[PDB]
Amino acid sequence: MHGAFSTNVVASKELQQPGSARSTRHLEIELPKEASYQEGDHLGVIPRNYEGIVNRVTARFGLDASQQIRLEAAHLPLAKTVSVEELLQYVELQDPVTRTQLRAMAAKTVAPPHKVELEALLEKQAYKEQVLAKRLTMLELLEKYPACEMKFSEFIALLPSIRPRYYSISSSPRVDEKQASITVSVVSGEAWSGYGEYKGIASNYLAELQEGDTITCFISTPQSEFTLPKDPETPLIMVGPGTGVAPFRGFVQARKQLKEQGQSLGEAHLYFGCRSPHEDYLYQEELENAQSEGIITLHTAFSRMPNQPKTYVQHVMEQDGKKLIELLDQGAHFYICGDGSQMAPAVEATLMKSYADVHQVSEADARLWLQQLEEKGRYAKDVWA
Numbered sequence: 001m002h003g004a005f006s007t008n009v010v011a012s013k014e015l016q017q018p019g020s021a022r023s024t025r026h027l028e029i030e031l032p033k034e035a036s037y038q039e040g041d042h043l044g045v046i047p048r049n050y051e052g053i054v055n056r057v058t059a060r061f062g063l064d065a066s067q068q069i070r071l072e073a074a075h076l077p078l079a080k081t082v083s084v085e086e087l088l089q090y091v092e093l094q095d096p097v098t099r100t101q102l103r104a105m106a107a108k109t110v111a112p113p114h115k116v117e118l119e120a121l122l123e124k125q126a127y128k129e130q131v132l133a134k135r136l137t138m139l140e141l142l143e144k145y146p147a148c149e150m151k152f153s154e155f156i157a158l159l160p161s162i163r164p165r166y167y168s169i170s171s172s173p174r175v176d177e178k179q180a181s182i183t184v185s186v187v188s189g190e191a192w193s194g195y196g197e198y199k200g201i202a203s204n205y206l207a208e209l210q211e212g213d214t215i216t217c218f219i220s221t222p223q224s225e226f227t228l229p230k231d232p233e234t235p236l237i238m239v240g241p242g243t244g245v246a247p248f249r250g251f252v253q254a255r256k257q258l259k260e261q262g263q264s265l266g267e268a269h270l271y272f273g274c275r276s277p278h279e280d281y282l283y284q285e286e287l288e289n290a291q292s293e294g295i296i297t298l299h300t301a302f303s304r305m306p307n308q309p310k311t312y313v314q315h316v317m318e319q320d321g322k323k324l325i326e327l328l329d330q331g332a333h334f335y336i337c338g339d340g341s342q343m344a345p346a347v348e349a350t351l352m353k354s355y356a357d358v359h360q361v362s363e364a365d366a367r368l369w370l371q372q373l374e375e376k377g378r379y380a381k382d383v384w385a
């Protein structure tokens with residue numbers, strides 16, 4: 001289920017502070033009559049490959065972007081004439097090199113030591129350590145091996161089809177049913193492969209869009225429900241550092257409308273973490289206003305404030321253990337969003353340890369407690385790698 005539609009960008013702006021070395025974007029997108037969404041839904045984005053990486057390919061093959069050509073034997077337009085540059089928007093250009101890809105290159109290689117090296121990469125250990133660990137691509141190996149006689153049409157056909165990227169919708173449909181926002185951390189750094197500068201495909205595509213540009217996307221609803229309790233007095237604990245705040249911005253906007261409609265709201269704790277308020281404290285103004293209107297209680301942790309200890313949300317949670325565990329005993333829902341590889345597990349461990357300490361039980365009893373909480377639908381994750 002990818003029921004995709006084309007539509008316009010209504011806003012696009014930077015969320016980090018002037019002089020941050022990093023970027024996080026906020027985009028507002030319009031939705032057509034047929035689409036609709038709910039808090040905790042995702043936007044599926046079909047991205048385009050950026051100019052830099054398209055030019056690296058046409059340069060390697062000595063081709064002009066506009067050169068029309070036709071293929072025949074990825075989801076490629078076959079038996080149609082189509083330029084090179086548009087063919088190149090159908091495929092992934094920076095996935096690790098596959099074993100099929102390596103064999104194809106080896107077979108077209110006429111410098112013998114270079115063939116020995118490409119074949120070396122097929123072995124189990126080398127493949128794990130030099131290809132997969134560093135995310136070494138076919139493109140980077142073609143640039144390294146200019147006398148590999150592979151040709152464009154064989155290149156294009158060996159590549160995977162371009163995949164969508166998911167973003168947690170950061171707005172509530174209770175404010176505007178036909179407009180949705182996303183919050184996009186921009187992937188950028190030195191390539192782990194060693195070949196220059198790395199840019200994440202969808203995130204840099206999204207970062208470069210402007211008001212009036214079009215975008216192809218669809219609404220996706222996750223198998224794991226990530227929604228507010230049915231009763232607005234049921235207490236919430238939300239942990240969402242960095243771009244993890246995204247779905248909680250939707251939660252905040254929802255609660256704010258429910259209040260404006262006379263509903264009473266219970267406690268809602270938002271644990272937010274970032275480097276610094278001088279840098280990446282996304283939506284600070286909105287979140288401080290929300291807190292002032294009693295929509296949330298806000299707890300921050302800063303990793304890089306001069307003259308302060310490095311603080312993460314789990315450290316703050318641990319200080320607040322007693323209170324957070326009493327809340328969960330009264331029927332609170334707990335939510336985590338953001339980084340699933342390090343932050344989520346550590347937050348989970350701190351929650352269980354708070355339980356163990358408060359209720360004087362074993363770690364096994366604390367683990368069973370969390371298991372039961374999840375099975376009741378009260379412990380939800382919107383995390384990613």
Ligand SMILES: Cc1cc2nc3c(=O)[nH]c(=O)nc-3n(C[C@H](O)[C@H](O)[C@H](O)COP(=O)(O)OP(=O)(O)OC[C@H]3O[C@@H](n4cnc5c(N)ncnc54)[C@H](O)[C@@H]3O)c2cc1C
Pocket residue numbers: 042094134135165166167168169183184185186187188189190191192193198199200201202203204243246382383384385
């Ligand atoms: C359910 C879900 C919800 C999500 N919600 C959000 C969200 O709300 N906001 C958000 O910003 N993202 C979100 N993501 C992540 C998002 O979908 C994209 O994966 C992310 O934006 C990166 O995709 P990309 O195309 O820009 O980069 P890609 O081109 O796909 O590259 C991604 C890969 O590059 C790797 N990489 C990173 N740095 C380097 C480097 N220097 N050298 C080599 N490789 C590197 C990454 O580890 C990753 O493996 C979500 C993901 C999921 C699954």
